[PDB]
Symmetry: D2
Subunit: 292 residues, 4 copies
Amino acid sequence: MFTGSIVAIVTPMDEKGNVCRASLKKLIDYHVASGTSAIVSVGTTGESATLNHDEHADVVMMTLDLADGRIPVIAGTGANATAEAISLTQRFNDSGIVGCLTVTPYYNRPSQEGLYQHFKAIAEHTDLPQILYNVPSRTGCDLLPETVGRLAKVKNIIGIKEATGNLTRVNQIKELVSDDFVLLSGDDASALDFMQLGGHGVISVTANVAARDMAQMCKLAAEGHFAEARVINQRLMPLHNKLFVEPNPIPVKWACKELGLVATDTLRLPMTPITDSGRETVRAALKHAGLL
Amino acid sequence: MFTGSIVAIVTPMDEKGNVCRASLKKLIDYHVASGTSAIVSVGTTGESATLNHDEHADVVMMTLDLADGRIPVIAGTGANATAEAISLTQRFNDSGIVGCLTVTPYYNRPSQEGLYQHFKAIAEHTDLPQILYNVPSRTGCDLLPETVGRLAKVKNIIGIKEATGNLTRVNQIKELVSDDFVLLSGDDASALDFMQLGGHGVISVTANVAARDMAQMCKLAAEGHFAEARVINQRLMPLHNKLFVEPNPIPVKWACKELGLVATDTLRLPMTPITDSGRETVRAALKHAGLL
Amino acid sequence: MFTGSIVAIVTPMDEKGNVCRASLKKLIDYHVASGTSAIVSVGTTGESATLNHDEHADVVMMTLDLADGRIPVIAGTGANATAEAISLTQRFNDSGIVGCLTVTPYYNRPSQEGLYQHFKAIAEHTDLPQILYNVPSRTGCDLLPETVGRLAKVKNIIGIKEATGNLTRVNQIKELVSDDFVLLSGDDASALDFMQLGGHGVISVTANVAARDMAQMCKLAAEGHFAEARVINQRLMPLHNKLFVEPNPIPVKWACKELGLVATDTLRLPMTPITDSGRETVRAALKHAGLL
Amino acid sequence: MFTGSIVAIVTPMDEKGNVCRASLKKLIDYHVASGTSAIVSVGTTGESATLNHDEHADVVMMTLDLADGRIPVIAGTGANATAEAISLTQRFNDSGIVGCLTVTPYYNRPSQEGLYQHFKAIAEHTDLPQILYNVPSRTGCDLLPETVGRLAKVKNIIGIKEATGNLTRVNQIKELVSDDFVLLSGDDASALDFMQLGGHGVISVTANVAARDMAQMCKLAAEGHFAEARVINQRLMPLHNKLFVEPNPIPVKWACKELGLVATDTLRLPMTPITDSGRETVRAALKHAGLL
Ligand SMILES: [Cl-]
Ligand SMILES: [Cl-]
Ligand SMILES: [Cl-]
Ligand SMILES: [Cl-]
Ligand SMILES: [Cl-]
Ligand SMILES: [Cl-]
Ligand SMILES: [K+]
Ligand SMILES: [K+]
Ligand SMILES: [K+]
Ligand SMILES: [K+]
Ligand SMILES: [K+]
Ligand SMILES: [K+]
Ligand SMILES: [K+]
Ligand SMILES: [K+]
């Protein structure tokens, strides 16, 4: 089930930049306790960009193991070469992950036909459920509703993580896909609006440090208690924004460390330690949300 | 050396998507005869995106081999993880390439401080000249003149391929760097304007098929004969545009096939075959350039 | 009451470019019959830009007269000089119009403080209800939520026509204003989404030629029957878009003439007659909506 | 005549927002002494927006009177209704002005065909030289090079003030027009780059306060001495930017007051007094330019 508050979980690292298992276990336990619906392992927020495919796989398998059946795990499987997307997706075949989150090729800027071919080929080499992921500001590429429509016709392409923040997409996509195709926000600041328009949940950065509020907000939203959800949202909104005061996941990793959830806020270059001014910004926002 | 018309050469492939050595030979001879200044190997137009680092290195080594000292070769060495940039660069230590073209990290959207640390670390791990590469439309990331200025103080950071098409950047960068830092256009359509404002040459997609004209145009511009250079540019202008009618390098690979310069116009997914409408727009552009 | 489907009514002209009273009467009767909630007289769609203030006033007074108490009339009162906004607003004082629609100054690009001062001064010279109007693509100016908040504190500033198509504004504005402040869409293509997020109606261009469907859609929306409303919307959507195939109100005036609702589709320069290709586009869209 | 440094002169006002003749005299003498090429009267920087057409005409006539044949005067004649453009232009028939500066219609967003018909009709109703004026950020409308090309075929359409800051426009326009059509920058910050690409001068806000430097810089550029011109430009550059730290002409009116060139820095709403933060940014910029 790909609904509700789904965390794009940080990959906690030791001071050397390698996965820290104690901190991962702790984060996973926190999400199990907190009511988080599922975990996305090595998405954008999990530093897919700076992990090689072996390291990437190690983190996913380790996340799966530690989740220990208590919470479903979705593997990030994006690559800008179709052959590499297939090959990464194959690692997780018959593994216990429940689906894949797969981003539009970045940098090489395919046509809509190229995007169609890319995702169709990936979905054909797998039985795993596929969630498409559109994030033009990172990729240089925009997966348009008409093409989500085409791809939704492939049996195991089952959802989209829509990160544009362009709310008109929720109903442009909905009208082109079956009732069971799932529409997830990839933008925390607009994700409650997204759900109010008919979206089914959010793949959240905010949920890393505010898992309980996020899960409650998404459940309120799903029950149509939009006014009640919005009280939570307005408490989380400074966070929704300030977790991007510097490049994700620089802010949210610091926040995790500040909350005692991870041992170190280490990232891999080209991500750099949070600035002193970033700290104070994110600290303010944690306080506003009643977490500090 | 890093001046004039520098070709971002296509990586010619057989029907199976593998580097075609015989086609790479025709192309490399074509540039030796046409007065091209240097060859950028496995840049963007070279399908850096869809070559794994070992195929990437192959193509660079084969290019060096075939060029046989007749024309200098620059390796594309861009990666969005600093560690991977460094280890890619180290691949080409002692290789015979004259420098590296290294793009801002794509997808992960580092700060300017992160770009600084990225490029600094890369330059620290090599003796080869480094040409920075800014192309925000592909990367999600914009390397700003103030950061180019800091980086230009590093001994072997010697130039920038500036591909925004924002021509105010020429003299913003030029103000901040020494007289020997090279400013190269990475946008054919605005490259003559770029040179006329003080740029030193172009890393060119058009040069793939219009090598002699590109070489003459850039020499005229270097001499200050802008009116005469502009005459050539106006013939090339449709080509400058239509080589991007569908994602690069789809149109320019097709153009090379149509001229007999490569055996097939095959690309790797997510790049897809040229459309019929595209064929006709490109063929017209080539005729306008007097090339067919 | 400033809710439901509110038409931004064309100013029908004879072949000389002067208001045509027979066609105006006919349009007003059509809106009375059709269930249209209120009329906005000489807004953008009513060619405020090419009417002088005397002509502007004549059309408003004539519209009021013909409405004959059957349907409320809102006067467009925008001007980019505060003195002229006040002076136009004064014409309609004690006239029988029920409120004013007043746009952000265009061309001169005021600060948010300037916007505050502008609207506060206008509201102070009148007892009439004020609906602010934000349309950055026409004005060069963007009235932000925080400033709508400030102005909403002025007694007779009672609503906003929000034309950005940026749906995040609905709840950013809502959380800053009292429950009785009215949020109206100024963008037909996103207006049902706007209402689903908490908006109270739409100031519509589409409603000119599809008044009955629009009024029904808005009533469904207000009752929370969003799925039912959307069937209507999807029938109207080609219209929502193609009424801007050429600059408004060129398309919608042709459509009015095609439907027999006005005698001529004459506009004032710089608006030009619909192109033959525009005709066919708008005709297609009228057919899709079941109006032709 | 329509070359070099042309000043978009402020309209100096007393405390009551009325044209101050004594201040207009100081300014006009300042430009005669500083070698300014010509004076644009009641352009954008001249508060065209908030002057009614009769005050507008006054200020133009007073400017002509005070200039006393010592420096040529161009009238701003822009209006978004073609009829109003024509009747404004006819106001200045036989007046002594040397030409007109006429902006694309703002707010109503005409097609390119509409812009054509607009400017054609205006040029047909006068013998005075017409300088087109493109500034999309204010108007919502972009007059494209292909339409400039058509219009340049009209006898008395002799030039363009191009204010996009998009420098590719210089030679796109230049390709399409005769050698005697003038291309003028309407963007100070990029005006030297503009001239270096082939532009003939600048209609300048900076010239209000840096007249002698602006005149020298433009003469050097006209002579091809770009390095020497650039030295001046780099001193002026903070001023080029900070004169737009708050909406034009708020900062430049304040600068004029601070230099003693005008008695008050009063503006008309919706322009508001300069902030204290603005004061300090401008004062610093003026010191950097060596003007204080
Ligand atoms: Cl995005
Ligand atoms: Cl770019
Ligand atoms: Cl530019
Ligand atoms: Cl807008
Ligand atoms: Cl939106
Ligand atoms: Cl502009
Ligand atoms: K990676
Ligand atoms: K499916
Ligand atoms: K690659
Ligand atoms: K250097
Ligand atoms: K008007
Ligand atoms: K109020
Ligand atoms: K005016
Ligand atoms: K002419």
